[PDB]
Amino acid sequence: LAESVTEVEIFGKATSIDPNTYITWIDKYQAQLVVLSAQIAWSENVETALSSMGGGGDAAPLHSVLSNVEV
């Protein structure tokens, strides 16, 4: 779980994910671990975006997180 989270953090902090690396990462780890790592990455991403949005809607990273989810 620690290793897969370390990998999926690097995956999340990026745009235009290369299919090959994503497939290799999925094959490397177990189903529960890959799902849980995706969940952890999204949770910490949203927490960081909300923390950076203390003042208000100005400069909101949530659009970046949502776009990453779409990619």
UniProtKB/Swiss-Prot annotation:
Q: Which residues of the full protein are shown?
A: 1717 to 1787 of 4646
What domain notes does the record hold?
A: Dynein heavy chains probably consist of an N-terminal stem (which binds cargo and interacts with other dynein components), and the head or motor domain. The motor contains six tandemly-linked AAA domains in the head, which form a ring. A stalk-like structure (formed by two of the coiled coil domains) protrudes between AAA 4 and AAA 5 and terminates in a microtubule-binding site. A seventh domain may also contribute to this ring; it is not clear whether the N-terminus or the C-terminus forms this extra domain.
Per UniProt, subunit arrangement is:
Homodimer. The cytoplasmic dynein 1 complex consists of two catalytic heavy chains (HCs) and a number of non-catalytic subunits presented by intermediate chains (ICs), light intermediate chains (LICs) and light chains (LCs); the composition seems to vary in respect to the IC, LIC and LC composition. The heavy chain homodimer serves as a scaffold for the probable homodimeric assembly of the respective non-catalytic subunits. The ICs and LICs bind directly to the HC dimer and dynein LCs assemble on the IC dimer. Interacts with DYNC1LI1; DYNC1LI1 and DYNC1LI2 bind mutually exclusive to DYNC1H1.
Role, per record? Cytoplasmic dynein 1 acts as a motor for the intracellular retrograde motility of vesicles and organelles along microtubules. Dynein has ATPase activity; the force-producing power stroke is thought to occur on release of ADP. Plays a role in mitotic spindle assembly and metaphase plate congression.
Query: Where does this one sit in the cell?
Result: Cytoplasm, Cytoskeleton
Q: Which domain of life is it from?
A: Eukaryota
In its UniProt entry, the species of origin is given as Homo sapiens
Paired cysteines (S-S) = none
Q: What is this protein called?
A: Cytoplasmic dynein 1 heavy chain 1
Name the linked condition.
Charcot-Marie-Tooth disease, axonal, type 2O: An axonal form of Charcot-Marie-Tooth disease, a disorder of the peripheral nervous system, characterized by progressive weakness and atrophy, initially of the peroneal muscles and later of the distal muscles of the arms. Charcot-Marie-Tooth disease is classified in two main groups on the basis of electrophysiologic properties and histopathology: primary peripheral demyelinating neuropathies (designated CMT1 when they are dominantly inherited) and primary peripheral axonal neuropathies (CMT2).
Q: What is the lineage of its organism?
A: Eukaryota, Metazoa, Chordata, Craniata, Vertebrata
In the record, the note on similarity to other proteins reads:
Belongs to the dynein heavy chain family.
